[PDB]
Amino acid sequence: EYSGIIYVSRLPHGFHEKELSKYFAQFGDLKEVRLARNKKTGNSRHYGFLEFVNKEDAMIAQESMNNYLLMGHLLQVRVLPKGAKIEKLYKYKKRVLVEKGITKPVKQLKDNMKQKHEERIKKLAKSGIEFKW
Amino acid sequence: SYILESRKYDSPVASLFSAFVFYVSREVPIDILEFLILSCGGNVISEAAMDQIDMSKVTHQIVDRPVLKNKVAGRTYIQPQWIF
Amino acid sequence: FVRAESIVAKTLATSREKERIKRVSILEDKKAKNETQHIASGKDFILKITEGLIREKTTYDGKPALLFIVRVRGPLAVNIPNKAFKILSLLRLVETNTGVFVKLTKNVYPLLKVIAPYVVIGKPSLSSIRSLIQKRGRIIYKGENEAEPHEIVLNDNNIVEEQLGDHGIICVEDIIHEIATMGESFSVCNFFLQPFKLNREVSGFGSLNRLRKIKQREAESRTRQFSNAATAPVIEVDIDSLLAKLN
Amino acid sequence: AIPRERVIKAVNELIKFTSKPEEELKKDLQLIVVNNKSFTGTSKSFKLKLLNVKHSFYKPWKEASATAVKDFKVLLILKDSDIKKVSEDDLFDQLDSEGIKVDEIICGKDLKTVYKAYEARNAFISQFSLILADDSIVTSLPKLMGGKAYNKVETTPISIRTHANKEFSLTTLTNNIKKVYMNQLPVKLPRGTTLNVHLGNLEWLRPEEFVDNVELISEQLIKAYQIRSIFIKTNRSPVLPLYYNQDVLDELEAKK
Amino acid sequence: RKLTRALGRGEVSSAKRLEENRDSYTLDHIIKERYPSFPDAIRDIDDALNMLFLFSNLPSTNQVSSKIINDAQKICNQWLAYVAKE
Amino acid sequence: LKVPPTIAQFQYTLDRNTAAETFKLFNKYRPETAAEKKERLTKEAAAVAEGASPKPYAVKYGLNHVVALIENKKAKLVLIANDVDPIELVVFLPALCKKMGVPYAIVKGKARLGTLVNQKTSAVAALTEVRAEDEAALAKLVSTIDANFADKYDEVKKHWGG
RNA sequence: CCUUCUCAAACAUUCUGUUUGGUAGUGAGUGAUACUCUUUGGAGUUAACUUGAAAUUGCCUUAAA
């Protein structure tokens, strides 16, 4: 027997849990709505998972919408086998750069410039191709 | 409005104020203002026109306010009802 | 019914507002502080469009001058966002098609770019003011009766003088100088007036009427512009004849 | 700075490293790498740069690629209303003098309509290399061209100020496409600690061009941006030293 | 029925066309038939000055159509141009 | 009464939405009106009378013409009404396109097709080569009629209805 | 059933010239080379590739009734 959840792919831009829950509630109040968003550069992965109340609500909403078309996108939506356990994909965002540096004085960092460049000329010396500086 | 171009008055009930003009405030009644001053020779100057922002031959004035504070010398006052 | 399309539609519309005004506020950040290091331009403008379409650019650099405000719908797809909805809420222009005067100083000026894509705007003329008040305006008044959650047409000079006894004002044509030549603070004149509800230019849902409805969708969809740049200069038009029609 | 003979032994002995026997187009490209403390901070900025160079590797890119597989060719983007003003056969009378001719002059209107559909898009832009645009639109290009073709300094548009003052007329397009052509090598200034300008193709003119290029560019950008260390390679290469500057290094301690 | 016809289908262009192709009739025969010639015209007009000036007052709403207002007021100003100049 | 499998394949049509989309498309393509041709040919008439032609576009709607586009094969999608006075006329299209691998689509009403074409009726209106603007909307559209109509409706081929 | 930041000042008067600014993406994945970093926290950056806007679980109401 299948699951109560509905897999949804093909999710256009401007279609999120506002719109997900907003629309799909018409099939009954849904337990869960998740949209798979991007770890950075905030936007989605264009698919998400849902679950409503009972298997029947999933029947209704799915089959009603399974091939439904919108904007440029026809939305392939279908249930899953027993369970399938929506787990992960928390709401993400675009996590801004945190800049810590540079705690050390030019001692070890300008050193590591030195030793790193010296051993660099070592590296090109292994190539081997002979340079200077 | 309406410049009127081509191609004796009531003898003599109208055609009064021969080369003679009036001034009116803003406060003078708006629906009735230019009527007989256009129907009997002369000018109308409303302070309302100066809300865009003459005052020379003016003698008679018109104020419907309860009071005028203060007057002006060379201007011989009348209420609006005078025009009647 | 939801009409699921409509859902996403509103959404994207709303987004174009947010990201717009947000940018605008950051411009309002760097035109507040003159904190500019690298920006587009620190100078604002007004885009003056008149009528085949003859245009030009200026800058307001006030010099307080009244903008005339006529609200008409747009852009039809959008849920009001916060800051727009409030900055209007001052001008109470929701329940749309509400015409109002607003004096524009340079503390009035930059707050416009939020209102830009809503009301159509332009310096009025005399006969537009006198003619627009002479046919409209309403006063909320109490006396002798009337606990009154009710609005009164403008006739009675008793209320004219009476409520204007503060400023020593009779005869709302005094307010004309208070407005046309922009009298003291100007404010209680218009707050007084409880500003205006236009009749829509052409009524709707009829046979021949539906034509005119389309023609309006045409010209209204052209002459109403935007940048959406946060550098968007304001749009100004000649509203006089517009109010020969609308009022 | 810097010694001539250093980068000259690096470029000739580099011709040694490329002397050993698409993939070729991968190998032979000579790239100039440059670093610093940090590049311009906490802003993704797509602004490009017009470099002043000894000459342009455009013309060698053309002639040597006239037989190539990719066969690059030219674009430019006009504004809305200038399109009908400047025809295609207008601007052909002129550009020829330098041996350089555009193909197609389109409106972003057409990018937003016919050239959307991201496969129709990326397949329409990916067959190019050198790009043009106009500034006034370039501000609007981020959303239209989309997150793909800004991944190549190739495809990301150069900007230009085409419009004249006021009411643009074509003369400045005629001479100013030459201006954007002959002396200038656009280059991009991303975030991070690292930028590698894409320089040239080895099979083009003798190192006498390339070494001077290295000079003018190198000391050019050294000035303003206070770089840390500078390298050169051929697309693949373990880096080649030229100017190792620890002087301005200590500026790290200046602010911190 | 034609405009609701095409417009029922579509074809905005057609609708425009009909919009021009139509015309409003000319009253004028009855002005010469009913009030010949000059004086009979003057006769009752004052009844039309009542409404001319009333409507030329009126604030614009629907079933007013500020056009009507505009010609009304304009011919007020032309009438009063004829008396006030008269 | 029981109706043959080759009938009752009408009565299965496109939904509110998909139809709505199809007309979102074609309403771009209205074959120009008569007064239109009179327009352009009058203006050019005066032009070349005193004082460079991209291939025009429309939907190709002649029934004979339409079946002519098919069997070549040319067309891309075909719209077929559900009501023809001699219901005979169209009975073979849904088979035909079938065997020829053409995206046929049943859209309800002959007034509804007839109105996009500047006629009173069509019962068949179809297009093959389209401008590049909507080419994607086409590929997806036909993908939608495949997916909606075509997919689960193989059943209609058997099963006397009624 | 949505429609896209299509320009600025400055400088010098030349049918144009000079100069500084102004631009955050559909996503998915291929990837051999580096830079840089900081205490494992792997962070920002490095050639150039495939793609039907493809998929699976990286903690205001007159655009009504």
Author numbering:
A (entry chain E): 88 to 220
B (entry chain M): 261 to 267, 351 to 396, 403 to 433
C (entry chain D): 55 to 105, 127 to 322
D (entry chain H): 31 to 51, 71 to 305
E (entry chain M): 88 to 173
F (entry chain K): 69 to 119, 125 to 235
Which sentences did the original study use to describe this structure?
Ribosome assembly is a highly complicated process that engages more than 200 protein assembly factors (AFs) and many snoRNAs. The earliest pre-60S ribosome is co-transcriptionally formed on the 3′ LSU region of pre-rRNA in a stepwise manner. The maturation of pre-60S is coupled to the dynamic association of approximately 90 assembly factors, hierarchical incorporation of RPLs and sequential processing of ITS1 and ITS2. In this study, we determine the cryo-EM structure of pre-60S at an early nucleolar state.
We affinity purified pre-60S using the bait protein Rpf1 fused to a C-terminal tandem affinity purification (TAP) tag. After three rounds of 3D classification, 98,155 particles were selected to reconstruct a density map at an overall resolution of 3.65 Å. The most striking feature of the structure is that only half of LSU is present. Domains I, II and VI assemble into a native-like substructure, but domains III, IV and V are totally absent. Therefore, the structure represents an early assembly intermediate before the global architecture of 60S is established. A total of 12 AFs and 19 RPLs were modeled in the map. Five AFs, namely, Nop7, Rlp7, Nop15, Cic1 and Tif6, are also present in the early nucleoplasmic pre-60S and adopt similar conformation in the Rpf1-TAP pre-60S. Seven AFs Has1, Brx1, Ebp2, Rrp1, Mak16, Nsa1 and Rpf1 were newly located. Rrp1, Mak16, Rpf1 and Nsa1 form a cluster bound to a junction region of domains I and II at the solvent side. By binding both domains I and II, these D2 factors appear to strengthen the joining of the two domains at early assembly stages when many interactions in the mature subunit are missing. The structure demonstrates that the global architecture of 60S is first established by domains I, II and VI, which constitute the major part of the solvent shell of 60S.
